[PDB]
Amino acid sequence: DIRLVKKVGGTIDDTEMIDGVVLTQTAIKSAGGPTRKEKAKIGLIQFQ
Amino acid sequence: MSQLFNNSRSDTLFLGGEKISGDDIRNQNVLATMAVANVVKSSLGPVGLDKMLVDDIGDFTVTNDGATILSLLDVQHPAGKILVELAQQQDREIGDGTTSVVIIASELLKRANELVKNKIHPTTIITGFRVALREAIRFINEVLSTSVDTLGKETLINIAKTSMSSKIIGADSDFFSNMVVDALLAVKTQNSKGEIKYPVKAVNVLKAHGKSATESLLVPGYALNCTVASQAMPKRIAGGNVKIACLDLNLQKARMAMGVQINIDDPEQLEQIRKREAGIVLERVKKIIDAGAQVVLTTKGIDDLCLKEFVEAKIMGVRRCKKEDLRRIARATGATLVSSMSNLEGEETFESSYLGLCDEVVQAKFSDDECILIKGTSKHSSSSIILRGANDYSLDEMERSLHDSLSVVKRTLESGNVVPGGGCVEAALNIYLDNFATTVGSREQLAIAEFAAALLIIPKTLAVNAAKDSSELVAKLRSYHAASQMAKPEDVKRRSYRNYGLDLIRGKIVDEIHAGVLEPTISKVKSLKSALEACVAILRIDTMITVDPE
Amino acid sequence: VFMNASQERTTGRQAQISNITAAKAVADVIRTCLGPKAMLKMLLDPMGGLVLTNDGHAILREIDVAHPAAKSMLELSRTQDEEVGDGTTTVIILAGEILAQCAPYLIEKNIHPVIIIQALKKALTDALEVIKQVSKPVDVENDAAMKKLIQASIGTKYVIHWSEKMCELALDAVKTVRKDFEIDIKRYVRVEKIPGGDVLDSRVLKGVLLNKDVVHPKMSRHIENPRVVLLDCPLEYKKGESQTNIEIEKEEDWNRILQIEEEQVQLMCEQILAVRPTLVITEKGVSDLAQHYLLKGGCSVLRRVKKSDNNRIARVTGATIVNRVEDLKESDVGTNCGLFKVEMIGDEYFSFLDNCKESGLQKACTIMLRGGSKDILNEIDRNLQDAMAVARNVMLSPSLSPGGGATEMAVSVKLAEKAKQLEGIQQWPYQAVADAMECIPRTLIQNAGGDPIRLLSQLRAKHAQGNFTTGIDGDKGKIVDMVSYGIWEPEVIKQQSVKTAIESACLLLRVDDIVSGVRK
Ligand SMILES: Nc1ncnc2c1ncn2[C@@H]1O[C@H](COP(=O)(O)OP(=O)(O)O)[C@@H](O)[C@H]1O
Ligand SMILES: Nc1ncnc2c1ncn2[C@@H]1O[C@H](COP(=O)(O)OP(=O)(O)O)[C@@H](O)[C@H]1O
Ligand SMILES: [Mg+2]
Numbered sequence A: 001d002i003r004l005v006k007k008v009g010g011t012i013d014d015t016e017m018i019d020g021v022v023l024t025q026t027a028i029k030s031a032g033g034p035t036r037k038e039k040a041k042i043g044l045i046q047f048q
Numbered sequence B: 001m002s003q004l005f006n007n008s009r010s011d012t013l014f015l016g017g018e019k020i021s022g023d024d025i026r027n028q029n030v031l032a033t034m035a036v037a038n039v040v041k042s043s044l045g046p047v048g049l050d051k052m053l054v055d056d057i058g059d060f061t062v063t064n065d066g067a068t069i070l071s072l073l074d075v076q077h078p079a080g081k082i083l084v085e086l087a088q089q090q091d092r093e094i095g096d097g098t099t100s101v102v103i104i105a106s107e108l109l110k111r112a113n114e115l116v117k118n119k120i121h122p123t124t125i126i127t128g129f130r131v132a133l134r135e136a137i138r139f140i141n142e143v144l145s146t147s148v149d150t151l152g153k154e155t156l157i158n159i160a161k162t163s164m165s166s167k168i169i170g171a172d173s174d175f176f177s178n179m180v181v182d183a184l185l186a187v188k189t190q191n192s193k194g195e196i197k198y199p200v201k202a203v204n205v206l207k208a209h210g211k212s213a214t215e216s217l218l219v220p221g222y223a224l225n226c227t228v229a230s231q232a233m234p235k236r237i238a239g240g241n242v243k244i245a246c247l248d249l250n251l252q253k254a255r256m257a258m259g260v261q262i263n264i265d266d267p268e269q270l271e272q273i274r275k276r277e278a279g280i281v282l283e284r285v286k287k288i289i290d291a292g293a294q295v296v297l298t299t300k301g302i303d304d305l306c307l308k309e310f311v312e313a314k315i316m317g318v319r320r321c322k323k324e325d326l327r328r329i330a331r332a333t334g335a336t337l338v339s340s341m342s343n344l345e346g347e348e349t350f351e352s353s354y355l356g357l358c359d360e361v362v363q364a365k366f367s368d369d370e371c372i373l374i375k376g377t378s379k380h381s382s383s384s385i386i387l388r389g390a391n392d393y394s395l396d397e398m399e400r401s402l403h404d405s406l407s408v409v410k411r412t413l414e415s416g417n418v419v420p421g422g423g424c425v426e427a428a429l430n431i432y433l434d435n436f437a438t439t440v441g442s443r444e445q446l447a448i449a450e451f452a453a454a455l456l457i458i459p460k461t462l463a464v465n466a467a468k469d470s471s472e473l474v475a476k477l478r479s480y481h482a483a484s485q486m487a488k489p490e491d492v493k494r495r496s497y498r499n500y501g502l503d504l505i506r507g508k509i510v511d512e513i514h515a516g517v518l519e520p521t522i523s524k525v526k527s528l529k530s531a532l533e534a535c536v537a538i539l540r541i542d543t544m545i546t547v548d549p550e
Numbered sequence C: 001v002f003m004n005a006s007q008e009r010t011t012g013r014q015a016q017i018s019n020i021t022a023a024k025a026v027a028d029v030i031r032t033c034l035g036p037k038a039m040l041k042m043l044l045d046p047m048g049g050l051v052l053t054n055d056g057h058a059i060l061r062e063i064d065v066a067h068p069a070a071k072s073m074l075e076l077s078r079t080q081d082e083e084v085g086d087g088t089t090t091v092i093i094l095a096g097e098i099l100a101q102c103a104p105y106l107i108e109k110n111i112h113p114v115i116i117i118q119a120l121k122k123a124l125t126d127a128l129e130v131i132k133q134v135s136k137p138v139d140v141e142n143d144a145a146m147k148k149l150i151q152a153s154i155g156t157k158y159v160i161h162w163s164e165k166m167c168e169l170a171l172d173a174v175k176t177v178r179k180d181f182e183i184d185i186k187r188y189v190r191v192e193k194i195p196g197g198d199v200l201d202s203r204v205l206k207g208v209l210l211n212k213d214v215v216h217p218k219m220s221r222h223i224e225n226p227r228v229v230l231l232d233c234p235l236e237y238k239k240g241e242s243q244t245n246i247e248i249e250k251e252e253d254w255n256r257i258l259q260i261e262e263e264q265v266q267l268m269c270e271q272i273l274a275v276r277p278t279l280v281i282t283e284k285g286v287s288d289l290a291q292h293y294l295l296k297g298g299c300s301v302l303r304r305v306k307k308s309d310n311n312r313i314a315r316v317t318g319a320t321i322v323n324r325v326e327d328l329k330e331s332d333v334g335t336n337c338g339l340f341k342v343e344m345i346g347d348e349y350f351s352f353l354d355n356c357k358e359s360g361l362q363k364a365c366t367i368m369l370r371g372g373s374k375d376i377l378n379e380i381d382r383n384l385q386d387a388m389a390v391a392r393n394v395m396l397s398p399s400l401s402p403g404g405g406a407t408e409m410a411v412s413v414k415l416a417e418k419a420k421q422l423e424g425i426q427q428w429p430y431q432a433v434a435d436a437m438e439c440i441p442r443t444l445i446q447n448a449g450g451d452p453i454r455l456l457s458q459l460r461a462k463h464a465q466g467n468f469t470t471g472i473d474g475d476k477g478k479i480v481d482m483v484s485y486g487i488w489e490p491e492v493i494k495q496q497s498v499k500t501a502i503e504s505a506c507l508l509l510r511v512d513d514i515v516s517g518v519r520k
């Protein structure tokens, strides 16, 4: 259940615990989509 | 420093290369550390000199940045890759202190290895470095100086000249100072609900060799490097409110989706189907021309089929360019980048809100290269710098010289507190840690005392490359700093010293405030933290094990 | 071992000595290539050709020099060519002498390079002001003044015998391309060469010279007023982006497929006949079926044309390139074509398009050249590019600098006077710049066969009292003034020689160590 995400760079002191799910994958941004959404409902798409 | 190699024991067998243990590993770690350290020692400081590296194809690279030098060096030693990746981590995050963090971390390994032979345990040595670093950071916060009573941009101008030193632009740093400060202020944006941030690399760097470097023009706007599609198009747009169209859609003869196979039972349908293939593209370009767009930017190549209508309509066509370059054009001019042309309704349409606005769009020819100069943007301002030099190899150095100057000024406006440079902090941290550890003492006093003298490698290396007397300058840096540490904050005098020293040009001790040399506080922090992790990781290694490749 | 490194690492002063010695050998080869008496250098390429020229640009380009510092001198050749095109040999000789003359020290004085660089920046600023004071402006509208200006670069070449004819070709080529500020470019100037013939018979002809004969015997090779229309699309049958894959159920459908291919091409030919063009130029290949319906209406067919030639044809006749035949209109049809003729030469056919010469887009023109062989043509072409580039500097920069080595010697005199007044620690690097400036006029004496000791001694004495136009005579090796010498050179050529040479010297002085063969 515990998920440990690794990111290159930084210092060990910067390690901290997050109160929610951390997404390792990154957005697309090729079409210029908003990277920050406040009070949003996160969905899951198993189709294509 | 390793002789006789090592006797292979038959009772100890492992697949692959032999296993070496004991003091031989730490002796080879320092030997591999001093190998990459001696390369960046001569390149440090305004009196320093860079090195040249041949690529075996006849091309070379001339740069003063320690990150590029170490990046071109592929180290087969396992512990040697840490210092190589340390420079790539230094310029990526802070953007400054690349040569210093390699030299600081090198002296930390040389002194600690001599302490391991003293029989003190490495963890006690590491404990001494971490306790001394915690108090050293607190001393950095005490020497912070907030800019006050300064006239205009002189605060950022004097700080930008520090990064320009030691590089080919150091002699021209007087003229280049106003170009770097005005470049990052034009790209100023807003994010995080009120937080001010700056883009990296947003300022375009164009390479045209000719005239002189002091004549480099600063364009009040973004400049894009591309060649015009058709030579019959006008290279200069007259009149204000020039409309720029940023598009990701190429105009070309295109094949229908691979999942489609055309089967026709009549020969009469061959005329309309072949004509419609080119007619579908006409519907997209026709609505754009009718909107009055003067300049049309396109991410992908455009065939000559659609370039005919651009000549009759006096529209300037554009072909393949970098995707990240077209984003800042639409944001500056007000245009909206369109990945695929569509509307909420099921019918195709084009809105005038997707067109940018600027004062003019002109194409200037620098030497034999032609580039577009976009000046007077509407929505957001932009900037570009065209570097000029004698040869293309000097322009390659001026790019990294300009990129490093943009990172120092970027960290300057994020934190108003700055610290004096030129070996002043390294000399101040020495005495502060000398009186430190005297209260605790015991065994940890020796490991902390060596950490204070380890920071002395930076001010001593600067005096060696100047062909001057180092012992004369180092003895002065210890004279002014030591006596003033005990001062009481009244009766003045006192602490007015210790804030300056180590001027390499005149070889005298002068005030850094009147000189203008300054460094951001962000460059000092995280440099010793990254150098500590590089020192701790190598020091903790007793035995190196190498496995032969399959 | 460790990484990729070591072998023999050159460190200390010997690393800078190797940079000075290697860069000095670059200027020693073309040292005899300076002056009107300059010799020639024959180069042997790995491709099997031959390059014989006195221009330091083409000499240093083909020669393969393997060395970290010496290759930086090779890059300076394209700096003078691409920005200006004249003075490539002077920059290499000057930059080669500056590194030797301005930095013999650190072998002796042990002066830090940056200290010398700080003096080189101040010496470059003062050198520009001296050139501006000795430069007298010249009228750009005087034809007699432009002819003697083009002969400046011609005096050192082989075309000096034809210089009277050469200035006629270079003046008309730059004035035609000039568009009204007055920005011109050599991309529209055609370098096409004709093997054999007499140099006096060569002339600049307006229009584009095509190497292709008419396609059909009934095509008229003589037209009084040709009308040219450019087509990017091929006259053949377009297959399309996707396969047609006709499924033929009945035997009558297959014959209709081949029948439409004749009518579909005919449909594109009927739309061309609406503007009744006399000459049709197609960028791609043409079918033998399309030429018949064009011949019936009077249109002329030609071989496929490269994209580079299509842009020059549109400028001469004012035509607009039309890809879509359906969108072809009378407004895009080229007019005002003087003559269309084809002359027979054993190698290839040649098609001539003459302009009626009578603001708009800049006109295009081709330069015909009749040499004695194929390699002589390539030498004059490099001479025309150097001669026509001189006319581009005077139009953008009306200022006119002194020639014949008077520019470099005038700076050396002013630097020596301010060297004693400056004093300080920078007096040695600042005074050493004047010693490198007098080497260029010294080369003129060594090639002429005179005594550089007695001539340069009287040149410096007569420079202060007499005038700033005093210089070395190339042919007679005597002391003459550029006023009566009648030859001058633009200031842009002298400014690029001082800036490029000094800015490049600062790069080689900063080199500490050299490591070869690190990785790729
Ligand atoms: N003009 C100058 N005068 C005195 N000290 C300087 C000057 N320029 C830089 N320094 C000092 O040299 C150190 C290293 O600078 P530099 O070599 O430009 O960056 P890096 O070490 O990242 O390559 C800095 O800490 C700064 O204090
Ligand atoms: N007839 C001449 N007499 C004396 N000096 C000349 C003569 N012609 C050219 N020079 C000098 O030689 C220099 C280079 O001229 P030129 O040989 O035409 O160009 P390049 O050296 O690039 O071939 C000029 O600066 C000029 O002062
Ligand atoms: Mg720096």
Ligand SMILES: [Mg+2]
Binding pocket: C086, C087, C152, C153, C154, C156, C386
């Ligand atoms: Mg010449």
